[PDB]
Ligand binder design. Sequence first.
Ligand SMILES: CCCCCCCCCC(=O)OC[C@H](CO)OC(=O)CCCCCCCCC
Length: 230
Amino acid sequence: GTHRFVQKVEEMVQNHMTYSLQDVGGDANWQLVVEEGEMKVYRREVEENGIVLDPLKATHAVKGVTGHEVCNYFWNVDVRNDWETTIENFHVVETLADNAIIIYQTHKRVWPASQRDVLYLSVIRKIPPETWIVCNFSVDHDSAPLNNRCVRAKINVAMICQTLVSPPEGNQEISRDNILCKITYVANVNPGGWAPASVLRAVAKREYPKFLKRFTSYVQEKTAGKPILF
Ligand SMILES: CCCCCCCCCC(=O)OC[C@H](CO)OC(=O)CCCCCCCCC
């Protein structure tokens, strides 16, 4: 990367690789709040100044897809509405590089309160499984100032994927049967204003697992029977 946010991207990617990849399942500071299938959703309850900040971390394992494929579908704005259900509208404010964009988006009223908007850098990176990661983090832009309609949320999100391969023996080439993508998804969101704590927590518990199930299911469908993109 040659652009003005490279140092910040690289620090965010490094922070996620170092801290977000740790297993939280034995970590007593985290609570397992939703399990279904291979999916496990954890959170830490955190409030500051009355505002709910609970860090969220989920793990999943999805047969028959690669990390590259999952991060591609997570990042590529062209397919966003194929799977996303909380976003009202959104657009690319700036293209920084082939792999790095700045997105402005508005959300549907997921809890009863003002709509939030959010303005973030979205970058997709391969880290020498080689790990794929998409980092979405709030930035300011002169073309997207704050406004009176929406409360501005601040986000630090990551989708981190590793591909496990069990190639066959015999004269059999590798198929999607032989691959499994290990996912870690982190979301640290500042909702930007006050709301009833239990409401925000119940919305989180609903909307994150909903997203991960629908999204991974989507990637599975879109890649089924196609050549494997490692
Ligand atoms: C109004 C909601 C507060 C903002 C929280 C949004 C967190 C996701 C931000 C984001 O990175 O979106 C783009 C990214 C694709 O690259 O998609 C995602 O991370 C999908 C997450 C959607 C579920 C969020 C539920 C919010 C309930 C509190």
